[PDB]
Design a protein around this nucleic acid. Sequence first.
RNA 1: AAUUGAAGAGUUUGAUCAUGGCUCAGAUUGAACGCUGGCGGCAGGCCUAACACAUGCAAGUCGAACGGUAACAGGAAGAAGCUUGCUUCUUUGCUGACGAGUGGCGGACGGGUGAGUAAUGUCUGGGAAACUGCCUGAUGGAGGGGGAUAACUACUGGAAACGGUAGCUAAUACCGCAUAACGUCGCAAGACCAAAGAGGGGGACCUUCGGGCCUCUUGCCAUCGGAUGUGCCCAGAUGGGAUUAGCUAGUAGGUGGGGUAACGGCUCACCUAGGCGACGAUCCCUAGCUGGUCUGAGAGGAUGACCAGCCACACUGGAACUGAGACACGGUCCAGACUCCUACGGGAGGCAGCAGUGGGGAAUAUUGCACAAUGGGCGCAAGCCUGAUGCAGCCAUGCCGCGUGUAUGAAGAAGGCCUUCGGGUUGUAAAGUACUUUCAGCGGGGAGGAAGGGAGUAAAGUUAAUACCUUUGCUCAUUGACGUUACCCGCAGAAGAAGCACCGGCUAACUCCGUGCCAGCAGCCGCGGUAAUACGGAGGGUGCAAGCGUUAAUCGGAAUUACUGGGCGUAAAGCGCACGCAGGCGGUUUGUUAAGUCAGAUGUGAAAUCCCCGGGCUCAACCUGGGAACUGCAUCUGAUACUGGCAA
Lengths: 85, 80, 82, 205
Amino acid sequence: NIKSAKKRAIQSEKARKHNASRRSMMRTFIKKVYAAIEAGDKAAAQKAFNEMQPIVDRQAAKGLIHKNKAARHKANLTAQINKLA
Amino acid sequence: KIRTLQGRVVSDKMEKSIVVAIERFVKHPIYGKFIKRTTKLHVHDENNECGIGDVVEIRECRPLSKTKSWTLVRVVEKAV
Amino acid sequence: MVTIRLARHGAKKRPFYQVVVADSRNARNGRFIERVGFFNPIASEKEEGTRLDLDRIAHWVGQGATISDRVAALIKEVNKAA
Amino acid sequence: ARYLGPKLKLSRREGTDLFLKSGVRAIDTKCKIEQAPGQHGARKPRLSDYGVQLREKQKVRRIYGVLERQFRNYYKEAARLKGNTGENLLALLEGRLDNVVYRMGFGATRAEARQLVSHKAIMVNGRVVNIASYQVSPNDVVSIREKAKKQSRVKAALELAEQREKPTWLEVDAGKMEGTFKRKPERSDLSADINEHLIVELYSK
RNA sequence: AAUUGAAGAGUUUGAUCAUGGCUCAGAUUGAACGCUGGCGGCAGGCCUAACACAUGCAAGUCGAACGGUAACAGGAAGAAGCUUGCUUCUUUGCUGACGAGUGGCGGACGGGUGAGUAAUGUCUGGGAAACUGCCUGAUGGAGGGGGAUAACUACUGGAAACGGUAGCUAAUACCGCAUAACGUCGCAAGACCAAAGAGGGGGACCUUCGGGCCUCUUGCCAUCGGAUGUGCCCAGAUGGGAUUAGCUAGUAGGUGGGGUAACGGCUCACCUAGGCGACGAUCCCUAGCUGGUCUGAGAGGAUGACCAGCCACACUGGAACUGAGACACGGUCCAGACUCCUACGGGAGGCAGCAGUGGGGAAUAUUGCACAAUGGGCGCAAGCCUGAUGCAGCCAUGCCGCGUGUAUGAAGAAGGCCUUCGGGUUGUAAAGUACUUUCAGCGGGGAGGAAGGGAGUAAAGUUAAUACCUUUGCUCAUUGACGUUACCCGCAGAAGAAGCACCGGCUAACUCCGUGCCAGCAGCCGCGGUAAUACGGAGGGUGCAAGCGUUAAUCGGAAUUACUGGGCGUAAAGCGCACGCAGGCGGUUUGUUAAGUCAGAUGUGAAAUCCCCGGGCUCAACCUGGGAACUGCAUCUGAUACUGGCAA
């Protein structure tokens, strides 16, 4: 409707696309981690955890994951590897 | 100190939890008669030491399940 | 933002402003944290016209509160005594 | 909002001189007082208990020229004030500005005093008050303005002020044509024949 | 100083006393209707169709973030009529600025409505497992690069709405890289995580002579605090129905995984078989809740329009996206009903914002003026926006104030009505006479709501700088929608200004005439069938008064649900009689506890409202200062007579 709501519509669409991509990459890295924990692999899962840590902290800082969630992930996953190793 | 309550165990049979009846003794607003009045509470206990018919003190904590925001401190008076 | 601001309470064509401390996104005559003085722009030429609790104002500006232009003008009017 | 009719008729239903035509002459002499308030006025009423209470309230209102919602508000204010509600009610009726202008001899009647008050001929404390029911505080000076000073009325009215009893709670002085309401009138300082317990009981039913 | 507070009557009977119902007298209202209507002040105004909506406004702003120039006005340069001295035209964002666009912030506030919700809500009191844009304090960082994409241009699809394709460009847009804590994870060892510039001014130096460089202001990032706001939990309280007694399988709990900002069946797998319920679950009807309002002596009863706090909703049903915050009134998506446009392929809309329409209804307002004030958004500010708000319009809808004159005046005029025809009454009423001008009308004068903001100085601070900026004084023009304002003065003349109900008893106030169980009246008792104080008219009176009556609704009276504060032999009312569980109550003495109870303290019980003492509007209504109050709850400290617990 005829306003500056049109601009918020198009910006929220653009940011929807950007956030969906970054959120999807973050979730795939976390799937790498506890999909490596599905098999009994310690150092493979540690390599995947070191691969996911900067991106989850980074998406926490960029403002789309709200860092406590960031913390939870790494906390949960650390538990999984010292349940395993 | 902490605010706590005292009550008696009304039933027992649940997996690391208990339920405690509290007896508050309140004056009727219109009639001016002091009337007994209960408050049943789902109360948590780790390792379920208290059985049925006990008397137990009880404090409030964070939620531990649906209702269940209460946890014991001291089991007294278990006498059967 | 919390704001020390005026809030219109008198009758029609006869305002009496009460200076309050509100969360700034409330209504004008709505919800406030505390009222802290008043300002009558008439009152008569008698004694006051305005009293205003400077200790609580200094407390809230210590907390981070902002002050509108009228309340700043009134503090610049009642400076310490006059 | 005020009466505007035959006055001596109101004074004749009550059976008592309500001072409604004080004016030039002496005691009525052309009223046929007591005799006939209407066509069947020669009949004795055999009045009820509601009739005596009502008729007492009407006596007081028809004296002071007050209508019912205003009188009723005076009863509420006299009730809430500390003390004796009959005496408080007469103290509220006696502090009226048109009454104080009548008591000082500035008007011949209370309606003439009410027209002096109404036609901006009266100041209190050096400010002109246009209002019949202004409530004169103690230690006030109420006077006539320079306009409507030395008009005939007030002079004649002061001429008939000496025929009356010179109220104790005033400073009547007619030289300068200014007066001082000094204190509230005591119940024993006014009129002696109105029964205010009847109007307390009238409003308390 | 803050509770000075309580009325009855009519009607059962031939009469009585009692019981008992019905009814009246009071106060109130978002009121409507009937008759009447002068002025002002302050308030209030769709209670019904959460029905459908024409039209106009209700949310924008910033160039001191960025590419840029669509206009407007200048500047520079060129050419021309050339009056060689002024105009016309053109290239240049060069400048003040600015359409469109990117970007930041706001559109989650403000404003509306009460549909749903009987307890995921509200009120009161506790709590822990939290997030928090803007605002504030502290500690520090703010280095070095890259790829894009709008706008723009060129085609192109479409009736339109709206797109598509190919190139170009910027940033405080976006992304890496470095850096790394008193940050995250980890027991540690360690691992890992961010950023953005812009503006004002300037001595010297270096200029690829655009600017580097210095300084100030402002912005960015990280962490820890604070304040505010929000999310979550518990206990108590907050309608009616037992002619609704069983309800519940993610249901109740546990373990582990996931999820959220955060605890949690929030979710899933497995294990246990619980959980709720006669202290009323479940079902059904109704309903937004509160501060409060009305009534009441009070306790209560009814209610929750305005004003303020909380919740919920935004055509209907659902969903998420962006964001600090929404599952979003003037956002997105889908579906549905309706309405509209169409080239028939498809599109568009959402007044329960403010005015306004149509409809519904007994009923409820202007398609107004202004951002001057107060507040909000944006902005360094100027300022722009603001149907919030300030005001104005209409309406006796309420409350309050004032007016319609005042004094005199007996020939007790005339006329009306009654009359025992003597007179009485209307009635000092009118007329006459003498005064006054409130308000309305006319003409002048004229506060206050105006504080700020702008432009020059002077001083101080900062600094390399006597710049720039900030602060404080001083000076100069100014800033009012209301508004021919409030108010003051002058003019002319009583001149423009009184109705409505009632008159048998209750209930204040009476006769005549007309009608004759009719016409009709009525709240109850009841009037009217020929001399009606009850019907209709007249005279007279009574009550209220710019109002007055009727109707609807609430409380009172009603001690007719009785807690205060009732009853049960015969008026209604003792189970047909017992036994007895849960429940209620419990002789007497001592000791202990101190739960009830009592006393004090602290925190809270929002503000307004009620009450008290004051203050301002000429008074009043109204506004307002301080107190009291909010009868409560929680915690701590005591007392121990009574009640309870425990022991004897």
